[PDB]
């Protein structure tokens, strides 16, 4: 199945113009078919942004424009804003009944300029009902940090813990910051036998840690 | 004395489906190998006969019916089919013997801004009888009150335009269709194969 | 006005069959081409199937090998996708979409309107309902943890959807046992804890589970 190739990601400051290319072949774009551009916000369904290779869908600002020539097409954004961070896909049509709708690779658009933010960390000890169920889980929630790159460590009293740690990759927040979480699974015996448990998050060479106790 | 199938398929202009054109073939020899061996046809479906032996048979009356329809309506040009085109524009008998040939004509019958010269019948009082052609353009009364010659409440013009644009999907693009009907009567079989 | 809602997604075994449904409203249903597209988790978009306005012409890519069938029903204004001989690679979020109008210049070329999408997970594992636990604490953090469920997804609301400020639902994690776990938190004024009750609502459609958990500050 043929596709349309796009740059994997394009970045820019929130005052400049950026362009996303969409390369097709003689069978889809050079065959006389137009190109549609779809914008997908994180966690949401794709939305129609551009149709007809130049026309703007209803509710789309004039900062977005589209063009096509030869076997290629381009989407131009003038005056980048923080709300533009999303996935952008181009799409065209093939006359062959085996291909028809041909989709683009997809491009991640990101804006640069937001200041580095220390992560907000919340630590939660096992819930009484969980111990009543003979299970124990420590929850560490990290929110509102930039860049989306943190390292999570778990301390039992003052010694590192490596077993039972499940950590999620950082993900984009609607406010353009990042969030993540970590879970430490253990039996109530280990939870009670130790005085305290610490969750430590390293971010740009600065560590923020929280501690909980079975008391 | 070759049969003039060339001027039917290679004709510059085609007719609307409601006013489908018909050409009578007689007193000639037809080389069907030129047709079924050329892969320039999107659909080539023969009923009651396969094309391979059409060069060894003789028929009394041959009719080549040419028109232009929608791609997703090419399936309607077939025996025992229902739909707007089949029921109101061009009907084929259940006992049809002959071939249906259709090919994409987006480069020829489509234009930017829409080609509206092709019309199709939308409404009729009764289903079309096989091979019957209706070119009446009278107002269709859709129920209670008559129309007096004007449109409006349950009163519609019977014909609607196709609107063929080149950037439309394969299902919307125009297709040129030729229906070859072979008929054997108590009359001399004037057409034959080599 | 235009609304497309998908349903039927969940767990299916490898080699099994599933039926996805999509209800459409706000437009003349029988006047538009309908399409199914899919997106693998973190991957790009892939067109899956197409059907004409009259529903008698169906279109599929050669990659699917004809194990997908698209159908439509004007008596309910619904669109159905039947998937057969399913495999792990077919695990994706599936969207039903409406095409452009036949009057427009791009009829049957794009996807003007999209639905919420539904997750289809092809796995040899078992569907399991989740367990909900509370996480109790100027502002304080109040939350609930949804643990040991399969497959994705699960939605979390607070106070039957009344509370929206300060809410944060985190992406799930995959534990070694093969079961997912996520948490949902909310930051609230400390005084209000002494006067207002806080309920977390957890919806796991693949197992048809709904759990309301009372989160109360202990000690
Ligand atoms: C139409 O013309 C081409 C070349 O001019 C020829 O090869 C073809 O046979 C013609 N069509 C028919 C039906 O003879």
Author numbering:
A (entry chain L): 1 to 9, 11 to 27, 27A, 27B, 27C, 28 to 95, 95A, 95B, ...
B (entry chain A): 334 to 527
C (entry chain H): 1 to 52, 52A, 53 to 82, 82A, 82B, 82C, 83 to 100, 100A, ...
Question: What do the study's own words say?
Answer:
Here, we delineate the molecular interaction between a therapeutic antibody (ADG20) and SARS-CoV-2 receptor-binding domain (RBD) by X-ray crystallography and characterize its binding epitope. Here, we identify a site of vulnerability on the RBD of the SARS-CoV-2 S protein that is targeted by a few diverse antibodies. Importantly, such antibodies, as exemplified by ADG20, compete with receptor binding, exhibit high neutralizing potency and show broad activity to VOCs, including Omicron, to a conserved region that is present also on other SARS-related coronaviruses (CoVs) including SARS-CoV-1, WIV1, and SHC014. Thus, antibodies like ADG20 take advantage of the properties of two sites: targeting the RBS region that confers direct competition with receptor binding and strong potency and, on the other hand, targeting the conserved CR3022 site that imparts breadth against not only SARS-CoV-2 VOCs but also other SARS-related CoVs.
Here, we determined a crystal structure of ADG20 Fab in complex with the wild-type (WT) SARS-CoV-2 RBD to 2.75-Å resolution to decipher the atomic details of the antibody–antigen interactions and the molecular features of this site of vulnerability. ADG20 targets one corner of the RBD that is distant from the protruding ridge region through complementarity determining regions (CDRs) H1, H2, H3, L1, and L3. The buried surface areas (BSAs) of SARS-CoV-2 RBD conferred by the heavy and light chains of ADG20 are 488 and 204 Å2, respectively. The epitope of ADG20 overlaps with the RBS, and binding of the antibody would clash with ACE2 binding to the RBD. The epitope of ADG20 is only accessible when RBD is in the up conformation. CDRs H1 and H2 of ADG20 participate in a network of interactions with the RBD, where VH E52a forms a hydrogen bond and salt bridge with Y505 and R403, respectively. R403 is further stabilized by D405, which hydrogen bonds with VH S56 and VH Y33. VH Y55 interacts with R408 through a cation–π interaction. The light chain of ADG20 is also involved in RBD recognition, where VL Y91, L95, and L95c form a hydrophobic pocket to accommodate V503. In our escape mutation study, RBD-G504D emerged in a second passage of authentic SARS-CoV-2 in the presence of ADG20 and exhibited full escape, consistent with our previous finding where G504D abrogates binding of ADG-2 to the SARS-CoV-2 RBD, illustrating the importance of this interaction.
